[model samples]
Target: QIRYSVPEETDKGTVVGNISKDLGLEPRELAERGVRIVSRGRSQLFSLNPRGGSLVTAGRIDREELCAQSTPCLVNINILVEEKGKLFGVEIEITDINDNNPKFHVGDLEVKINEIAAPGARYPLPEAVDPDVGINSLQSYQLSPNRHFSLHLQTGDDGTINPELVLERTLDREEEPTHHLVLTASDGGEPRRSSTALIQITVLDTNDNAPVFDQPVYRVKVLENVAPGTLLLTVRASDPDEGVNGKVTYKFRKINEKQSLLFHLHENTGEMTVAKNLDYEECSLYEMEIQAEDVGALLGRSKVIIMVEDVND
Candidate 1:
């Protein structure tokens, strides 16, 4: 018994190996012995040339079809010759070729990461499938060039490739909410083949940010004769987060009981109002500290300077 290796998908009538040379038989002896090939399958894959004793392909050979998911695929055939009526056996190995490309089972890939998540986070990705064996199958993985994320790969015990998305830098939802990346899977062939998958990474919002006041200080003047329940300057503050986390309310941070009664700040609208009469003779100016708080209890502060102007009362 002898073993020979041949790349699959070769054209029909392509010489696989010289049986006469390998089996120690000359061309004259091959024709005299009436050499023939015998294969047991749906159809014969190889034929014996009697004149030259070269084993040639009778049909196209597909390594994937011959042995699905099996490595070192072997096709056994018997060669019969009439030299003293002896039957010789030979085995042909149908080696794999880079005929198949890697494929992703899922149509889309989505990854959600929190903005507060630290770097070095690992997220598993869907592995690609390649029917070819060994080097012809999925070999390595690559990620598109990006500042925040990279690709990590591992080989399983069964020779399967595992791909992971590794976070190299922190994420900020305020700067960018979503990231797009491309993952490529390649095989180790003469001319490598590869496939790409689109990955959408959504950076989820967290209460990692605080509300910011538009200005550090606001200066305004009010007349002492102004009636109660009158609207003063409207304070504004904005939060970077989305949803309830970004919702901001305004109020006085720390004020005397008397001052609280004199001014009323809207909790939801940030509208400041003069609740009581203001006397320019008694107090020429007033400094109030305003607080902008998000629903997450994150706080921001700003100062409002109100100058009381004496008016004819």
Candidate 2:
């Protein structure tokens, strides 16, 4: 076995070693014996220097293209002395070089997430491939900075990249429903080659967020003589969720049976109305609480202040 390591695309006639010394055949005697290099199999990658008995590269040897990380790849050559009818074997183990970069099979990755999923939910990522062996194989993974997601790199004992996506924080589909990020894979080669994949994430709706009021209090003023069934004001609230999770219905959260008779709310439209005649003599001010609850169980609370001014007398 001749132990020689050379970069790929080595120029022809690049000296590998002085095989004449190893074979114990002097140049003159090798000439007498018709010493030459014989192609072992399909490869004619190496040649023998007949004049100097030097072994050298005969053709192009691309480590990445030829062997592709199948270790112990050998280019066997047969040394024949025709006149003497002798044969010898030489094994040239082709080592790997860091000529190829890590590449993802899929350039674009799409993931769907549910906002209600708990933190630490994990989603697996596509694998990245490298043609080179050892340190030149895909080594590390990286994720671009984001708040709702984080990188999860799980490696075997040898430390190759086995990456995943982890949910770090809860997502609200109504606030920000989509995300674009860069997921990069790198190799441990000299100069460190890398490839980036586009990660597109879509947030799915869930019963994750509650309805919210624009203000903590709803204020209204009315005269003492406001007639029954008159619309006074409308209370509005919003939910940071999509679809049914965002649909809200309003009702009185804290009110007595008598008070409920005095004021009423439109369930679908969130409208406030006077259910009975108002008299400042009976009451000059009224305080009530109304709640906004999603179609789901999530709820929002707010205060409503109703002031009855003296009649314009």
Candidate 3:
């Protein structure tokens, strides 16, 4: 059986091969030899040009619909040449076209990462399935630029692409809990086609950061006559950690037992109050250290300064 490899989606009436010539029929003998194409199997989609003894397409052929991923759907065409008392035969083969796009199992891909996950970590991404064979299949991958992540790719034996999601930087869940990225998959087609996948990275909570005071030090002054149980000043610290990890409270990091009676710290508000009377002569200056601790108990310290002034000289 002679083989004629014709690409799928070829225009109708496109000449493929000379069936009569393959059967030892001369060009001038074409009028004397009647050539007709007959389907020996599933399809009768080929026509024999009587004038030129050529095999041509008789119908539209779509490889995607005919064979899907199975490329080169060969058509078994049996050529019939009319002779005085005998018949001759030739064969034709049809090839499939690269017409299908790459498809993903899930349109939206979701990836979860912990806040404490280290950099240079690699995560595998869902691959796209392309019906077309060869370079027409999934070719390469593209990931949007981000401070925390990057993308890498590998080509499979079938020419499909494997996308690797790599983390390149640290993440703060409290600052950005959900990261949205676009992953686009491309195919190596003449008019290239691509699909975008939504990648959502959920940053899970982890004890990765401690509370930090906006200012390392806070200075405040109160008169010696400041009344007892009076609000002297409030100190605040911020934490980037999320949920309970970011919840901060205030307390004196280290203080003398006597000083505890002089100043009272609000556990929830970070406000310091006077527990007793302040005397200018007893203490001209008061130095204190306030600790900001998160619910995780990660501590951050800030300093407070109080200068006592004379009420009446």
lDDT of each: 0.82, 0.80, 0.75
- Please list all clashing residue pairs in model 2, or write none if there are none: none
Best by TM-score: 1
Model 3 misplacement above 4 A: 10-41, 44-59, 77-90, 144-150, 155-161, 169-182, 200-205, 214-218, 224-229, 253-263, 275-289, 302-313
lDDT of 3 by residue, 79-111 (tens): 556664345544455564556777778888778
Which of 1 and 3 is ahead in lDDT? 1
Q: Report the poorest 10 consecutive residues by lDDT, candidate 1.
A: 253-262
Question: Please, what are the lDDT tens digits per residue for candidate 2 over residues 79-142?
Answer: 8778778777777766577777888899998899987789989988887788877788887888
Predicted structure with the largest lDDT when compared to the true one:
1
TM-score of candidate 3 on Cα atoms, chains taken together: 0.71
TM-score of each prediction? 0.79, 0.72, 0.71
Candidate 1 C-alpha lDDT tens digits along 1-313: 9787788888878877889987778876787767666556722877777677788887878988889698778877887776556777888887778889787887569999998888989998987899887888887788888999888886678855678888979999889999888888888887998888889999999897788898899888988889888888788998878888999989887744444467788888888888878873367798988899887888899999999998765
TM-score of 1: 0.79
State the local distance difference test value for candidate 1. 0.82
Ranking by TM-score: 1, 2, 3
